[model samples]
Target: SHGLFKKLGIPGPTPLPFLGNILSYHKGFCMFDMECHKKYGKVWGFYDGQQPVLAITDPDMIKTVLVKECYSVFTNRRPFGPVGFMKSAISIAEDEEWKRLRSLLSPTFTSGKLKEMVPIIAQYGDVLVRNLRREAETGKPVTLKDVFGAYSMDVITSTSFGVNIDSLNQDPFDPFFLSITVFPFLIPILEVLNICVFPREVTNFLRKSVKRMKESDFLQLMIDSQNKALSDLELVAQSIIFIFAGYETTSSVLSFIMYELATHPDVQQKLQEEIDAVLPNKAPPTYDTVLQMEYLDMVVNETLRLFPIAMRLERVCKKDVEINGMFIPKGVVVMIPSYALHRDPKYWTEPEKFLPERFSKKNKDNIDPYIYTPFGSGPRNCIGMRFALMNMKLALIRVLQNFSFKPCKETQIPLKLSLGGLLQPEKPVVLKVESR
Candidate 1:
């Protein structure tokens, strides 16, 4: 029967040969996965095709994997079929290449650099608010996800490449964006065909964009820093990755934040109060002003806790490792489902409800750092965290200062998440806005 999990004392849902649990994962990930955790306890084994995978929700085991202790054994991410230029991006790089790329890219996200980028980010935030105002003037609700996603794209393009890409003017349903929308659902089929969903023409377009850029921006800085270590195409790869990662995740979080604020007026008012008190004059909120608002931080934290963009974190074992009496063979993939851990009743109170106070200073101090990592943890955590945080804070401050979110007839309370990708809504998340 090839029941290695049974022989090894690992319990999990039965898997078919060759296909294994890939179908289950592709079918529905978040809710079904949480069901598995509730049924199988914290740690269990499952198969991904012929490969063995350990799905771990136990905090201590998570701590071991993410923190320094098990880092060497789990230094690399699970492999994906290589796409041409993208293979060189930091997110997919392994071993020495990853270290080199990370080192070069780290300086771009420094406090000084991010502070410089604030005015540019604020510029796009203003554009976003203006666009929303136009929609509000129509007396029609609009989907914040697509709108904010375009806003995020503009900010990243201007900051990363020193080009103002007017994504708002472009078609929101463009083929380039649509390519990603359906790709997640088709991952299994695509994998079987050994096809990469990221279109080749997109790479060509990015290469041309990079070639024409004259300003010394983030991408230029990487090229200057790692002159010989990276090729021109590698430079383009890193820039494209910066655009995708910086744009998508931040936009996803803001979309969810808007949805929460619409449904919970009290929480939204508290956030506005914090913003108002911090920026009493209603002058454009400065970098320091945005960072200092404690309640704003708490609201973002709670939103992330509830609807984390990256639901799962994974790493491949480079060597055999043992933890909590469980033997892990080398080359097995270890998955940490952050969605399950964030909502676990053991770690959070009223895990199903929206409560910003759960992240308030008094309670936050007592919480474990490992339990609340929305950006992930340890050496390999998100490199652009500071940039993303600053972008969100500045946008929220500006938007909430000018307008207030309200639930509309179309607003979906307790939004149903999409089956794949960064926790998007299954339907358009629409809401009304009123001038503050």
Candidate 2:
């Protein structure tokens, strides 16, 4: 191949012919990107298995790539070689199809729909607290990753698919739980293999339920918006994405929030006060009450800032384009690593500190959208941002009403993250539970 990085005068680690910077990514792209940012400045070029990949984190360029130039120059992600219906999965969808799917599927996450979902989501949190209560009595720390995985699965399936399958009680794992239990790190490879990823039995069940149109859950909302814009397979693809995207990300956020609360007792207590004020005496949580809890919002934002699950936002160049006098050629995978950006010393004071006030009402205006974006930016940011935030705040507030989390021996003081489907600790995020 040509000396593309040399040609562009972009600095990055020297790469090999075929393997090309694979060693640099051995520690995961998020970690490597931050390290590279420190070394190469804001813009850098590296190779991914012989193909040159570009990365940028500058303010104006980020705004250009993510928003101003999004529709015209950068719309599709680099190909994942998805087969059949998997191509329609919103994350892998391209250009016009991506646009159509996003528009058609967006309604399910709207205010009214998320408001409809509050009760359905809260029920799972009850099961979560119930399960944790049994463990809380043990006085031994419980690993929250395992706990939230099931809770998230239960909520995502019941709310999105209307399946009512609760993994919290369903001890016997099924193919549906494969992604969570198995080394889902192999997911991209396994997805390409088209092996058990779909588990058509569960898929078929949802399709059957969809025909009946019996519930006001997430999937039903999709059907209401379908209006014949998508067919059975296309509908199934979108359904799969809703589950795949929703579960792991939400679960990890829950884990991080709990861990952060455990580490910062004062912050946790402040949030407990907010919980008691807004949702007194273990009262049932409503969407409005959850929204009004300001301190809880700050804590969630801070937790997400420290540990963004889907840490990297990437897009492929549709055409050779230049922004701010920087030339970019088509076909390079460009990434903006939110994980790295979150910790940028230039933007955050004492960036490693767990301070919720950074996102507080009075200080929020100072935050640049291009930086500290855990949910990403622009129109195509996170389709389920509202849905995810609603479920998170609702579930979190409900739990804070009855119990508190504290650090135990098993808790990772500084979280050791290993990249897989999302940004999660290499070790389990363990915490001691205490009932109020």
Candidate 3:
């Protein structure tokens, strides 16, 4: 009697056994969601691993039902738990508990705290440039998925836990970089065995550092104002989430920016000109100088428009409610397909083109907030937005000052991507670099 979509009286592709409609995504999810949207209108239900997921694209439903529900109904990201230690993370917690952690962690991302982080970001920025200089001189295509990810990890670990990892790009088999490359089912096994994808020393350090306020990193900030609710395990949990959130999202966008700049050299020339114009005398770029450079913001936003790291923004229903003619029951995960929304012709003209001007001052106000949310909308949106933007802008400014991206023979064109909850290229993004 529980054919969920049919019982709920919503339209969707039929589920096939326990696998549900998950395996129907033969191509990438960008196409998969588009296919479903084309076949069945904007609002529909599809069973994903025995759970019916409501994928909605109707803009009215979004601004009203989706955004409005952030406080009362759809407050949680998922009706789910974690891979062991992740259960304590703010991203994985529920209701009041999530709010507790959010209150404790929110202060670290403020302007005062973020100003302290600029020098740390610049330190790694210089390191990334030096490391890439070795690769760029070889005239061999270097995979940004490896190098940029390394640079991100170094900066993230330093700012999050105050640990330093110097062997970011030089070594091939580094533990931090290599350990995270895994299959899903196997992840919990490592946690149960008391092992971690992060090097044990790093995780161990977080546990030990819970004693006192150490450095000016995010972890210490969380500890400084901690109450009876916070614990050592929770400290470890929050640190990992910061690293996990800040690391991959920043690195992925950085990779996409390199691909875009390499493929569109004219944009690169204009970008370089803007940086030069902004800071005519090159000192380690100040907080304000990076902020004043509008083209950087435009490029980052436009690239995010094209390749937002998360394919869908999910909000879990807490209490049963009706929206429009639809009866949405409790615990259903509601999704807005960020991939499809960014490309919708109604919102964007020539949706496939990469034009930074769309985000320029005159045009950005014309964009509907619901349609262009790379960081999501409403109160439960991504907390790490400022830090992520800062690192990416710093990384791009530092790297582009010395080198420009070039697609070599090995570069993947048309960008074949894997089916993603976290969108990434199916293969390595190989591109060479030339001196600016």
Residues 1-436, candidate 2: write the lDDT tens digits: 4378788888888887666776665567777888999998989988766567889988899889889999898897665431445677787788888888888777777788888888788788888888888898878788786788788888777877677665654322222332232233444665667654445455566555545545336566566665536666676667667776667778778888998888889998999888888776778989898888888888888888888876888889888988978999987888888888999999999898999999888998888989877877776788889888887887788778878898887677888787554476888888888988
Estimate candidate 2's alpha-carbon lDDT, on a 0 to 1 scale: 0.77
Candidate 1 all-Cα RMSD: 3.8
Count of clashing residue pairs in every prediction: 0, 0, 0
lDDT digits (tens) for residues 1-436 of candidate 3: 2387787778888877755776676576679787887788788888656666899887777875557767788778753321456567888887888888888888878888888889778888888888899888788788886788888888877887777878352221122222222223344556677664445666555455544334336766766766446776787778767776777778888999999998999999999989888867555777888899998999999999998887888888778887755678886789998898898877888999899999999899988888788998777778999888988899888888889888888787978766644588877788988765
Order the candidate numbers by lDDT, best to worst: 1, 2, 3
For model 3 the TM-score comes to 0.88
Which candidate's TM-score is highest? 1
Error of 3 at 79 (Å): 3.7
Clashing pairs in 1: none
User: How much does candidate 1 score in TM-score?
Assistant: 0.91
Stretches of candidate 1 off by over 4 Å are 170-195, 226-228
Which of 1 and 3 is the better model by TM-score?
1
